[PDB]
């Protein structure tokens, strides 16, 4: 029984050190293995400063706030190969730090167990596809977790503001921070965000206002795993603000609220908040689902570890994420729908809905 689990993590560092060698070989020994198109867009964007426009840019477009351009400006000096070498190492280092933060938030620590966890979960579909393009999701997750784990107002506020300046999606953590009654954190984060907007306006040729105006002014693919994507896939035409999308998001709001009320610890609350944010977002690719690792760790090591439901859900989530159902379906997706194939693009949505319902019911029956 427990004898098998004990001896596996006694040699955590070399299984982490074994998968990294395979990961750094796949990129540098396969055709189209180390293109890093997103890192290319990140770097070759701020190069057009002092001449031309950063938004009249194409790469065989840059649609990030000017604060990101200011941040990435001191990156075109370094040769691209060295930066590409360092980026992946930073990514796995951030993942290891995230697992360590989750362990400490539970109430214990173990370096070997964290190494084994990172080695096992490095190849999950969201994490697997995250570092294929060169995205920055893991760093933002690490920043949010560091802000959550801290106890000082200024540290957390500055971390949240800086994380939300570069990308506009990780501003949903304010919902959790208001839920935990940690006031003045939202105020300091808002001040930091406004200073980031001001400096972005000042550094570039007043392009931030135009960027925000254009922001207000494909989604039918199978990679998009949000409500809008699934409704559009089933219907065949764009859903938008339809007569069922309001009910579809409506009932997910109430399920998320009930599930949040069920749990009464930091990691569970932040996991439910991030799941709600993932489900509500209009465009949420599969690489945005890197938040299922802390949720899995909470399922396996949290207070509810004594139930035989939590175990079933954890194992099912692990196998489902490892298999990668939408990636498999992507080979059948038409260019622009047979219903046995169109009805399978909602597996992650139904899994999340079932998890929310189960947590809500077990929270209700416990009073």
């Amino acid at each position, epitope marked *: 029984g427990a004898s098998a689990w004990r001896r596996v993590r006694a040699w955590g560092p070399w299984l982490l050190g074994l998968s990294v060698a395979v990961r750094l070989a796949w990129a540098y020994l396969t055709p189209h293995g180390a293109d890093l198109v997103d890192l290319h867009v990140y770097v070759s964007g701020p190069a057009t400063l002092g001449h031309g426009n950063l938004y009249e840019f194409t790469y065989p477009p840059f649609t990030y706030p000017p604060f990101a351009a200011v941040v990435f400006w001191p990156l075109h000096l370094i040769p691209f190969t060295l930066l590409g070498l360092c980026w992946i190492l930073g990514t796995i280092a951030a993942l290891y730090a995230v697992v360590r933060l989750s362990q400490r938030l539970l109430g214990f620590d173990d370096a070997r167990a964290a190494a084994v966890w990172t080695a096992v979960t490095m190849w999950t579909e969201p994490v697997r596809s995250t570092l294929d393009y060169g995205q920055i999701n893991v760093l933002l997750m690490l920043l949010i977790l560091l802000a959550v784990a*801290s106890s000082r107002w200024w540290i957390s506020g500055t971390l949240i503001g800086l994380a939300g300046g570069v990308k506009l999606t990780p501003l949903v953590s304010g919902l959790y921070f208001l839920g935990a009654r940690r006031w003045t954190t939202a105020i300091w984060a808002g001040v930091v965000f406004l200073l980031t907007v001001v400096v972005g306006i000042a550094v570039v040729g007043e392009q931030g206002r135009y960027y925000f105006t254009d922001l207000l002014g494909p989604i039918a693919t199978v990679f998009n795993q949000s409500w809008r994507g699934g409704i559009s896939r089933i219907l065949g035409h764009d859903a938008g603000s339809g007569v069922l999308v309001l009910f579809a998001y409506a009932v997910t709001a109430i399920l998320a609220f009930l599930a949040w009320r069920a749990v009464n610890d930091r990691l569970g609350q932040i996991c439910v908040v991030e799941m709600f944010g993932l489900l509500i977002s209009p465009i949420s690719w599969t690489h945005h689902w890197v938040w299922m690792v802390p949720f899995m760790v909470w399922l396996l090591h949290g207070p509810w570890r004594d139930k035989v439901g939590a175990k079933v859900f954890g194992c099912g989530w692990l196998v489902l994420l490892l298999i990668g159902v939408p990636w498999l379906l992507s080979f059948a997706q038409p260019d622009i729908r047979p219903w046995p194939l169109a009805w399978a693009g909602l597996v992650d949505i139904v899994a999340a809905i079932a998890t929310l319902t189960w947590m809500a019911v077990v929270g209700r029956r416990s009073g």
Partner: antibody
Framework: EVQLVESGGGLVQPGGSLRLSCAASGFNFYYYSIHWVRQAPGKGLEWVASISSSSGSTSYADSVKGRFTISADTSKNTAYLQMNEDTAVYYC???????????????????????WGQGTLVTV | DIQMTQSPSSLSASVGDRVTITCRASQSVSSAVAWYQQKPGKAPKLLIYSASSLYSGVPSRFSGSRSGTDFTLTISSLQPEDFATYYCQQSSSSLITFGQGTKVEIK
């Protein structure tokens, strides 16, 4: 449910060594911390040592002559090993840790849960 | 090391009387303070943890504290005669220190 039992009490001589044992039932050591507290006869409580049961043992106060190891998942054993102080009564308790990060990692304890154990009657 | 000081002067154990005990600390223990109750011949038992969080199952010692570097317990009633010895500790400096403080009945 949760139980803690001690057995290593005796009449050791002024010089030598002895060991203690505090077993458990109904929970797992991997998520909690174990401490030993002693009390001289006619005086107040005094803390001796602390452990994490997941990473390692520290906090040996100033009379540093004990060992205080744990054999996790092997009969749920907690054992002390003295190399000599005075007559007292020793207790074993359970606690949980809380972590915080302000430019560096600091921690404290929540407080020993009501799952205490009965004492021993060691006497030098 | 962070020392502790109390005022072992509680007496007369009159039924329904209020109780106040002060644990005067040094340095900064932050909010890592707990209190215990022990009867003669028996092991102690936790009463209040986190310096402001009351436990689960203590009906006769419903109180709190201040957490402003000085801690008090408001035992509103003394119906079961609450004859025991109460202690305060800290668990912040990687070392744990205790105190004193008993209660006696009327003559």
């Amino acid at each position: 449910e949760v139980q803690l039992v001690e057995s290593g009490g005796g009449l050791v001589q002024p010089g030598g060594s002895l060991r203690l044992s505090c077993a458990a039932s109904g929970f797992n050591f991997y998520y909690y911390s174990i401490h030993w507290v002693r009390q001289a006869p006619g005086k107040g409580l005094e803390w001796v040592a602390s452990i994490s049961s997941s990473s390692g043992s520290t906090s040996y106060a100033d009379s540093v002559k004990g060992r205080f190891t744990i054999s996790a998942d092997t009969s749920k054993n907690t054992a002390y090993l003295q190399m000599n102080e005075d007559t007292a009564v020793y207790y074993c308790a359970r606690s949980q840790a809380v972590y915080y990060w302000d430019l560096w990692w600091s921690m404290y304890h929540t407080g020993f849960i009501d799952y205490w154990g009965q004492g021993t009657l060691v006497t030098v | 090391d962070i020392q502790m000081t109390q005022s072992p002067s509680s007496l007369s154990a009159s039924v329904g009387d209020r109780v106040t005990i002060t644990c005067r600390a040094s340095q900064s223990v932050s909010s890592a303070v707990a209190w215990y109750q022990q009867k003669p011949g028996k092991a102690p038992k936790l009463l209040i943890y986190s310096a402001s969080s009351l436990y689960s199952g203590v009906p006769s010692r419903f109180s709190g504290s201040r957490s402003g570097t000085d801690f008090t317990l408001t035992i509103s009633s003394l119906q079961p005669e609450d004859f025991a010895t109460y202690y305060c500790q800290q668990s912040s400096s990687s070392l744990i220190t205790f105190g004193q403080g008993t209660k006696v009945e009327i003559k």
